[PDB]
């Protein structure tokens, strides 16, 4: 049919079988780059705004303010434009001019914080703006807002169930906010009732999930896998539903993304390479060689044309 604005067209992304990964086609990828603003975050940008409207914490008067240097900023931007909200985003000077030209193009009130301060500097300034007029500003908080995993439970998960005819055995997904793996796992394990293996993927350079579950010292670090590796356990990561954690290094993630392009003709971002590299590893263990493995590919290549990818 016909969507009443762009936010309602989220999802229904396709499953594509890989030929040069896995074993005899047991690895399939879900291309989340085919979304209204071309990442998985389109789903949570839409539903966090929808939920805040249904809750009344977001009205025609109110203005969105958030701290995000990634795909969630673009997602909130396209949704705020599609639905008539003013929006302010904060971020460090670190950001590529193209990501800033994109956000200004979408009409964001960009507020730039100190580069050396980083992500914490951005979230600090956003909270001060929200302190100015709490009745005027709404922060949606992707790391904590349950509307984030809820939309994956209502769309991403069921799409995977339907398109595989219940045959999905494994879901592999990088963890940023954690909403994707949390929502998908809850839908397939709890609503459809199938005991799959939920595999979280994190950078080996910042393996805080592996370290936490192992009761080891939590040592966050810098990495190049944009979209994952927050360096902490997000509230929207439901640890209780995670069966397995795979770590991937930045160079392997980048090499795997280039292989997806050159060998599969799939234009995937760098966190897409990390998730596929973790999936290939499981898929070549005899214990998974007959299982159907579904891998989330969060974003598209051209988000990364001027980065280490090319």
């Amino acid at each position: 049919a016909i969507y009443a604005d762009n936010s309602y067209s989220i999802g229904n992304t396709p499953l594509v079988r890989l030929k040069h990964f896995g074993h005899n086609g047991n690895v399939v990828v879900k291309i989340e780059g085919r979304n209204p603003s071309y990442s998985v975050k389109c789903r949570i940008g839409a539903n966090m705004v929808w939920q805040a409207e249904k809750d009344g914490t977001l009205t025609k008067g109110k203005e969105i303010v958030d701290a995000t240097s990634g795909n969630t900023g673009i997602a909130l931007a396209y949704v705020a434009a599609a639905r008539g909200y003013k929006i302010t985003l904060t971020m460090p000077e670190t950001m590529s001019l193209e990501r800033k030209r994109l956000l200004c193009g979408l009409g964001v009130n960009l507020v730039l914080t100190e580069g050396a301060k980083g992500a914490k500097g951005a979230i600090a300034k956003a909270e001060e703006i929200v302190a100015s007029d709490p009745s005027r500003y709404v922060m949606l908080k992707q790391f904590e807002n349950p509307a984030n995993p809820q939309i994956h439970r209502e769309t991403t998960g069921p799409e995977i169930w339907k398109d595989t005819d219940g045959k999905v055995d494994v879901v592999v997904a990088g963890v940023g906010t954690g909403g994707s793996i949390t929502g998908i796992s809850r839908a397939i394990k709890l609503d459809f009732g199938k005991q799959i293996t939920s595999v979280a993927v994190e950078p080996v350079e910042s393996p805080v999930i592996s370290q936490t579950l192992a009761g080891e010292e939590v040592k966050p670090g810098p990495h190049k896998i944009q979209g994952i590796g927050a360096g902490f356990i997000p509230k929207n990561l439901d640890l209780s539903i995670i069966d397995r954690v795979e770590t991937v290094d930045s160079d392997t993630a980048l090499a795997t993304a280039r292989r997806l392009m050159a060998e599969e003709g799939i234009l995937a971002g760098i966190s897409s390479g990390a998730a596929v590299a973790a999936a290939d590893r499981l898929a070549k263990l005899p214990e998974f060689a007959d299982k159907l493995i579904v891998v989330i590919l969060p974003s598209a290549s051209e988000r990364y044309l001027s980065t280490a990818l090319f």
Binding site: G70, A119, K224
Partner: peptide, 8 residues
């Protein structure tokens, strides 16, 4: 390069 929720 990304840390502390940056890039998400």
């Amino acid at each position: 390069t990304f840390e502390y929720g940056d890039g998400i």
